[PDB]
Design a protein around this ligand. Sequence first.
Ligand SMILES: [Zn+2]
Ligand SMILES: [Zn+2]
Ligand SMILES: [Zn+2]
Ligand SMILES: [Zn+2]
Length: 127
Amino acid sequence: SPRCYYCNGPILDKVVTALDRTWHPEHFFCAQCGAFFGPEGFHEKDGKAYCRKDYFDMFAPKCGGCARAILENYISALNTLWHPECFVCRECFTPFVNGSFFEHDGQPYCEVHYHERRGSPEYFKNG
Ligand SMILES: [Zn+2]
Ligand SMILES: [Zn+2]
Ligand SMILES: [Zn+2]
Ligand SMILES: [Zn+2]
């Protein structure tokens, strides 16, 4: 049976396969972002485990789904790096110089637009 070398102990529950070796679930964590739940097909580097996103980070910042190479200015949000201008609501489409990054429905939003969305459950007079 498989044995967790990280704690030199036996493995009863689900065993994770890495570097042709067996490791425990609680003893197995991404050494890059350290926060996995249940991905599929990860890349190995230097005997380490990196998420799909971490793999790209090692090379360069890329938009989740806009472009490849990101200019100088960049913004790290949702564990992913996206362009500075890409950070805009699908309605305003314009950036709102403020500072912190706002996340909404897995997409970038403005400070006023972000709070305005949480203001009401469905809609309201303002907006
Ligand atoms: Zn272990
Ligand atoms: Zn990771
Ligand atoms: Zn982008
Ligand atoms: Zn906006």
